[PDB]
Amino acid sequence: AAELPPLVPEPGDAGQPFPLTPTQQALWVGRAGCYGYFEWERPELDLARYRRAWERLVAHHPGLRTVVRPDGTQHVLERPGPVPITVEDLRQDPDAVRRLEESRLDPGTWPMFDLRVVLLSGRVRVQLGIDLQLMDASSLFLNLFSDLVTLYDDPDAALASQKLAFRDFARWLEEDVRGGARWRADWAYWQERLDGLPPAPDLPAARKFERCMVRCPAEEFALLRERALAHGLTETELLVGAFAEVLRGWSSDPAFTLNVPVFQRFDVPGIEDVIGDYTNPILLEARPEGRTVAERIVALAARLRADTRHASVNGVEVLRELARRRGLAAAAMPVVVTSLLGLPSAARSITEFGTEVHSITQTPQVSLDFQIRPEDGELRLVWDHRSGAFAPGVVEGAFEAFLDLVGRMLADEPGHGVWEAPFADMRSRRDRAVWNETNDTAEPVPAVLLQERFFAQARRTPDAEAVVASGLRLTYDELARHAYRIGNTLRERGVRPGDLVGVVMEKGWEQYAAVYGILAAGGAYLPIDAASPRGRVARLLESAGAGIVLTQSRLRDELDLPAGTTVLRADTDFETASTAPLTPVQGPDDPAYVIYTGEPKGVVVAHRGVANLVRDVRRRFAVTPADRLLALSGLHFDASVYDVFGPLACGATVVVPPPFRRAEPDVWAELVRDERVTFWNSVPVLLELLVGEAESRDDRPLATLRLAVVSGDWIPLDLPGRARAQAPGLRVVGSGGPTETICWSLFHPIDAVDPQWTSIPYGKPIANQRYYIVDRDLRPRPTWARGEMAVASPLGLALGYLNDPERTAAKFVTLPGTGERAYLTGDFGRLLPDGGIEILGREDFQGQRIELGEIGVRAAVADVVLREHLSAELAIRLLPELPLTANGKVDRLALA
Numbered sequence: 001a002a003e004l005p006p007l008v009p010e011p012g013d014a015g016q017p018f019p020l021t022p023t024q025q026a027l028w029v030g031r032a033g034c035y036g037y038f039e040w041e042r043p044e045l046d047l048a049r050y051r052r053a054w055e056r057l058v059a060h061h062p063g064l065r066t067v068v069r070p071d072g073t074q075h076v077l078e079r080p081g082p083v084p085i086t087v088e089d090l091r092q093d094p095d096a097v098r099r100l101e102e103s104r105l106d107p108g109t110w111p112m113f114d115l116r117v118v119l120l121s122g123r124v125r126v127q128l129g130i131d132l133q134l135m136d137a138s139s140l141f142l143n144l145f146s147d148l149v150t151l152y153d154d155p156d157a158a159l160a161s162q163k164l165a166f167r168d169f170a171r172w173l174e175e176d177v178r179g180g181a182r183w184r185a186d187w188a189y190w191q192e193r194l195d196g197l198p199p200a201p202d203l204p205a206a207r208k209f210e211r212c213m214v215r216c217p218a219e220e221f222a223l224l225r226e227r228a229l230a231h232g233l234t235e236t237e238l239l240v241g242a243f244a245e246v247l248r249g250w251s252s253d254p255a256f257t258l259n260v261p262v263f264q265r266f267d268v269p270g271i272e273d274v275i276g277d278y279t280n281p282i283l284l285e286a287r288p289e290g291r292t293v294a295e296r297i298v299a300l301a302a303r304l305r306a307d308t309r310h311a312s313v314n315g316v317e318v319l320r321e322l323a324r325r326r327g328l329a330a331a332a333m334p335v336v337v338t339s340l341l342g343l344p345s346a347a348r349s350i351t352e353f354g355t356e357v358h359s360i361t362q363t364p365q366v367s368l369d370f371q372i373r374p375e376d377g378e379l380r381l382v383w384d385h386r387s388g389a390f391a392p393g394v395v396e397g398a399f400e401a402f403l404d405l406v407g408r409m410l411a412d413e414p415g416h417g418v419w420e421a422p423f424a425d426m427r428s429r430r431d432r433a434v435w436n437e438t439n440d441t442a443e444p445v446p447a448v449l450l451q452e453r454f455f456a457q458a459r460r461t462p463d464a465e466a467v468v469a470s471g472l473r474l475t476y477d478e479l480a481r482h483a484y485r486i487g488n489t490l491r492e493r494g495v496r497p498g499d500l501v502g503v504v505m506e507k508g509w510e511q512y513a514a515v516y517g518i519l520a521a522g523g524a525y526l527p528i529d530a531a532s533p534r535g536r537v538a539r540l541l542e543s544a545g546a547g548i549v550l551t552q553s554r555l556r557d558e559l560d561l562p563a564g565t566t567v568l569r570a571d572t573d574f575e576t577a578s579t580a581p582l583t584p585v586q587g588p589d590d591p592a593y594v595i596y597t598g599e600p601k602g603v604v605v606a607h608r609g610v611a612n613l614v615r616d617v618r619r620r621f622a623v624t625p626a627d628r629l630l631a632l633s634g635l636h637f638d639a640s641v642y643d644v645f646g647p648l649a650c651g652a653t654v655v656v657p658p659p660f661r662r663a664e665p666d667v668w669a670e671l672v673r674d675e676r677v678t679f680w681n682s683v684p685v686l687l688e689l690l691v692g693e694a695e696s697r698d699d700r701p702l703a704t705l706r707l708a709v710v711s712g713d714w715i716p717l718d719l720p721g722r723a724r725a726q727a728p729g730l731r732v733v734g735s736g737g738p739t740e741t742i743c744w745s746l747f748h749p750i751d752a753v754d755p756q757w758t759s760i761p762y763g764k765p766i767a768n769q770r771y772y773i774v775d776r777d778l779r780p781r782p783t784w785a786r787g788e789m790a791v792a793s794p795l796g797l798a799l800g801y802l803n804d805p806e807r808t809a810a811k812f813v814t815l816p817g818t819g820e821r822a823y824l825t826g827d828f829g830r831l832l833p834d835g836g837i838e839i840l841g842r843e844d845f846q847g848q849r850i851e852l853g854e855i856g857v858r859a860a861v862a863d864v865v866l867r868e869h870l871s872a873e874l875a876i877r878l879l880p881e882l883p884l885t886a887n888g889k890v891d892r893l894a895l896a
């Protein structure tokens with residue numbers, strides 16, 4: 001070690017100033033609330049006897065007489081006044097319980113505290129206010145309350161000799177001890193860590209103090225200690241370590257720092273009788289070190305003791321140097337564990353004086369304060385948390401978790417049970433009920449093929465308008481026939497079961513026949529865009545191993561393809577064919593399509609899953625054959641798979657639009673007006689453009705819309721209402737999911753946009769899908785907790801990535817929870833308390849921008865669409881229009 005200078009007690013300079021301690025100084029600058037409070041009920045109080053005791057206390061303890069000179073220093077007083085106790089009298093008052101309800105200071109003015117007595121009929125309520133600057137947690141419980149009990153019992157009773165008054169101790173640490181033997185070798189320890197220190201726990205926010213607590217009885221207190229010992233741990237070390245596990249539950253990162261203050265008086269003779277601020281924040285580093293709870297708790301506990309062996313540097317100095325190194329705001333420690341365990345047994349317990357009825361330490365720059373403190377043989381576990389520091393339920397839920405962790409520790413002999421269990425599930429009972437309830441989406445998908453359902457309908461209603469395309473219409477029978485024509489032809493050219501027939505073409509009726517024939521032939525269509533570069537279209541086909549290519553006659557020659565790949569037009573090269581039905585040869589778990597998306601990978605998608613989506617949307621939004629869908633997404637965009645297999649499988653009418661490149665909302669408002677369209681499906685920016693052009697027209701062109709499904713990007717906050725403007729009765733619905741999740745994998749009826757939402761929600765999960773939110777260990781999190789979205793399903797997930805079975809084996813994992821095969825979407829979100837998911841973006845944590853902007857795009861790893869208004873209500877680069885991507889959406893990569 002390195003011995004510390006002796007304390008030099010000079011009882012003469014008591015009045016003359018001494019400087020503020022570091023803990024206290026940091027408070028005396030935050031004021032420009034902060035004041036603890038207690039309240040004990042007792043049957044009958046003797047104010048006379050009471051008042052004397054409080055005069056004695058003030059007489060005796062110079063700390064109850066110290067004031068803060070406005071110069072920043074503090075001096076004792078000697079003739080302070082008389083103690084101001086304030087009696088309120090509410091005994092014959094009915095609604096005494098009302099006037100008593102309404103309840104709740106300066107170091108320049110003398111009483112740093114606040115005495116009160118309220119006289120209800122038959123019982124009395126002593127109310128002690130007190131200031132967080134005037135003394136500390138241990139001075140309060142071991143000196144102030146211990147003597148207030150003695151002094152109330154006998155105001156004249158014997159009181160200890162006040163050797164070496166606190167002004168020296170402060171003048172000692174500030175001058176004599178700071179700088180020397182131990183302190184130099186301890187400022188090394190922290191300076192050699194302030195770069196490895198993780199930030200404070202990052203819990204969920206929701207963009208006064210409240211209190212959960214429990215009383216561990218004597219019999220359970222003993223066991224709690226025995227359990228901590230069996231691991232070579234002190235109760236405070238077991239509980240810090242449990243509290244550390246519970247926090248990782250919600251924490252937005254597993255490594256964080258806990259302000260764990262020690263109340264060390266440095267073994268000084270007589271000091272354990274002087275009232276003052278012995279507070280030293282230790283910055284404990286919580287990194288998870290260990291495979292089990294014991295292993296991690298034991299490990300962290302060690303780093304706490306090393307952080308303790310080097311205490312003579314006051315944390316307020318570490319906290320200040322941490323702000324030097326980093327930001328200031330990136331250095332607060334608003335999660336603290338305040339343990340009074342292992343201090344000396346105080347003469348008297350405040351419980352003797354009266355039973356508590358209230359108390360709330362209103363610390364400043366503290367959102368959560370876990371207080372471990374013993375009272376009359378019991379351990380009082382207490383969580384004072386600044387209300388609204390945390391999203392709803394987060395703290396109340398973590399307390400449930402914590403109580404259960406501790407619960408198990410008392411239940412589980414060490415080395416068994418929870419102690420050697422790799423993690424603990426922190427999701428509360430509600431967390432789980434609501435998640436199961438919400439994700440009980442299991443429904444048999446009958447093994448009917450996709451084409452065999454459309455055929456089935458064309459024989460059911462053959463006069464029906466199947467496709468309507470470029471004026472040139474198409475009945476179900478005619479489209480069924482031409483598919484057969486195409487189906488049979490291909491199978492004759494040997495399109496064996498499972499082969500991939502590219503459908504390289506531009507928006508036309510010929511696409512609906514090309515797909516439904518490739519399926520009947522026994523294959524699986526590979527859409528590629530007929531607007532990609534001349535070298536890309538052939539590149540995707542060679543990489544996928546696709547021979548036959550169905551195409552339109554126009555721009556057949558504009559297709560530099562090899563000879564080993566046959567090419568048929570589909571508006572002509574097919575008409576002398578057999579309109580006689582093909583017999584399905586493929587199974588329902590075989591591929592219906594391969595849609596393509598740093599290198600580009602291709603998504604194999606089976607029949608069953610598409611079959612599942614289709615017959616849910618239809619049951620979700622009664623899809624009658626009356627409905628007429630404007631099939632606007634491209635066939636190489638995942639968004640199309642409903643337009644292909646949705647309406648036709650039940651009797652409705654696809655309504656192809658005029659091929660486009662730049663979004664042409666003039667034409668669409670027309671085609672929607674003309675063909676009486678009732679079903680809109682596309683990315684939100686296109687259904688916005690369409691609402692733009694529709695609002696600026698005397699007619700009601702979009703008025704036949706009964707249903708609009710925006711998905712695939714950010715559905716803007718105003719958009720559900722601007723559309724719901726035109727055509728009252730339109731029901732809006734937003735969606736999404738990766739192209740690896742078969743078009744739409746979850747739905748959120750947008751009936752009513754909350755103003756204070758950063759984003760529209762994402763959804764509840766559709767049929768046969770489950771949306772988990774997992775930590776980095778693929779474990780479900782509790783509500784509000786930030787995670788990656790793992791979409792679990794046997795029939796709702798893509799089969800895999802076309803050829804590469806590594807990016808498949810990596811992104812389609814087996815969740816350790818349950819065995820469910822699930823897709824790691826690489827999108828981050830958090831569960832909501834109605835069961836929904838909020839979508840936070842994807843690897844965007846360096847993100848709520850349009851949060852500020854709308855109340856205009858986001859930043860980048862800023863762009864709006866006019867003053868120097870940075871932080872307007874808290875590099876901007878305005879732009880006329882924001883740049884769309886290929887399919888719509890908002891091209892965040894092009895922006896920087």
Ligand SMILES: C[C@](N)(CO)C(=O)OP(=O)(O)OC[C@H]1O[C@@H](n2cnc3c(N)ncnc32)[C@H](O)[C@@H]1O
Pocket residue numbers: 597638639711712713714715735736737738739740742743744825826827839841842
């Ligand atoms: C499947 C689809 N939603 C269209 O229905 C889609 O976008 O296909 P994808 O873009 O090729 O698939 C991968 C990614 O899609 C992103 N995404 C879809 N919807 C989103 C919403 N509403 N908000 C944010 N991102 C969204 C995913 O993030 C996914 O990796």
Ligand SMILES: [Cl-]
Pocket residue numbers: none
């Ligand atoms: Cl009350």
Ligand SMILES: [Cl-]
Pocket residue numbers: 305306307309
């Ligand atoms: Cl040590």
Ligand SMILES: [Cl-]
Pocket residue numbers: 306309
């Ligand atoms: Cl050490």
Ligand SMILES: [Cl-]
Pocket residue numbers: 387388389390391392393
């Ligand atoms: Cl709250």
Ligand SMILES: [Cl-]
Pocket residue numbers: 720721752753
């Ligand atoms: Cl609205």
Ligand SMILES: [Cl-]
Pocket residue numbers: 885886887889
């Ligand atoms: Cl895109």
